[PDB]
Amino acid sequence: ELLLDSNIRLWVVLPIVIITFFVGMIRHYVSILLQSDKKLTQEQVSDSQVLIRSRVLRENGKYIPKQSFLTRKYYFNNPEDGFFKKTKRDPTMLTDMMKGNVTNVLPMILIGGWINMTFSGFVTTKVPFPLTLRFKPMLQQGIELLTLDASWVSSASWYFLNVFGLRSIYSLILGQDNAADQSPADTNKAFKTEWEALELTDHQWALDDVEEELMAKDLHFEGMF
Template sequence: MAELLLDSKIRFWVFLPLMAITFLVGIIKHYLFIFMSNDKTVDKQQLTDSQALLRSRLIRENGKYLPKESFLMRKNYFTNEDSGFFVKQKRQSTVKNPMSDPKAMTEMLKGNFLNMIPMVVIGGWINWAYAGFLCTKVPFPLTFRFKPMLQKDVNLVSLDASWVSSASWYIINLFGLRSMYNLVLGENNAADQTKAMQDQMSGAALSMPDDISKAFKAENESLTITEHKWLLKGIEQSFLN
C-alpha cells in the first residue's frame, strides 16, 4: 500500500483548530460552572462527624507510628464504653433521596448541561465540517483493533491503523487535555471531562454516609479490635549502628 501524504494546510485548518477549540471550550465551561454554581453550606454537625470518622481511620492505619500510651489514649477517646465519642454520640438516620432534593437536582442538571451540550454541539460541527478528514498519524505502528477508536467516520479497511481522523482527534483532546487544564485552572477544575464523569458516577454525597449511627458503630468495632504494634521498636539502635 502506498504511503499517504497529508496536505500541510490540514495542520492549520483541522489539527490545531480542533485542539484550540476543545481547550477554549473547556476554559469557558469551567468559568460557567463557577458562575452558575451555588455556594454549598456545610452543616457543622456533619463536618464534625466526618472528621471524627476520618481521624479514627487514621489512628487505625497509622497507630503503629505512635507510642503505645498515645495510641491507647486516642483509642480510649473514641471507644470507651462509658464516655467514648462513638458510644456517647447519638445520631438519627438521615437517609435522603437525591431525586427529592431540589438543590441536588438543580446541580445535577447544571452539570449535565455544561458537560453534554458542548460535546453535542462541537461533535455535530465536526461531523458537518470535517467529516472523513485524516488530520494526523501516531508515530508508532498499531494493530487493527485501534481502528474503531482512532478512525471514527473513516471506514477504510485497508487504511493503516496509525492514522487519526478528525472526530477521533477531538475525542482524544477532550480527555487528553487534563494536564493542561490542571496547569492553567488548577486541580479542582470543571473543565476536566474525566473528573466530571467520575463525579457523576460516584456522587459527592458518598463522602458522608447516609446512616451516621451505623458508621459510628462500624468504626467503633474496627478501632476496638485494633491492637497496637510498635513499628519503631529499636529504631535508636539502628541509627547508632
C-alpha cells in the first residue's frame, strides 16, 4: 500500500467532513432565514381557495347525493349562474428568484474550488473500489504521479463524495424534507381548465350501495371499555 502521512488525517480528512457537514447546516438555516412569504391580496387567495374547493369536490363528490352534485355543477360551469364566467382579471422578483435558485448549488461548487486550492498536492484517502483510469484527471487534481492507482483521491473529489453522501444524514438529523442538499401563476387558464375538466367529470353517489355492503357483516364492538 502507501504509508500516508498521519497528519493528513487530522487536518485534511476530518476538517473536510466537518466543513461539509456544518456548511450544509449553515445553508439550510440561511435558506429558512431568507424565505419570506410574498404578500397576497384578497382576490388571489380567494380564487385559489375556490379552485381548491372545486378540486376537492371533483375528487370526493361521491359521498354527496346526485341533486347536490348537479347543483354544484350548475353553480360552477353554466352561463346562467355566471360563476367561472364573470370571474377573472432587470425586475426585482426575477433577480431574487434566480439568486435563490442559484444559491442551492453554487456555494457547494465554490467551497469545492476553495478546498481544491487550499488542500492541493495531497493524497487524502483511498477510495475502496477500483475506479477507472479514465477518471484520473478529476480525482487526482494537483498530483503529478502517472502510475498511481486510480483509487487514490485528492482533497477536492473527497469533499465532493462527502457532500454527495451527507444529504441522507441531513434528513436524519435536521428534519424531514430539509433544504440542505445538492439536487397558480395564472387563474384564467386555470378557470378554463377547471371548467372543461368538471364538464368531463361524472357523478357516482357512493351511498347507493353502502347499506348492502354494511348489512353483510356485523358491527365491530369489542374494546368498548
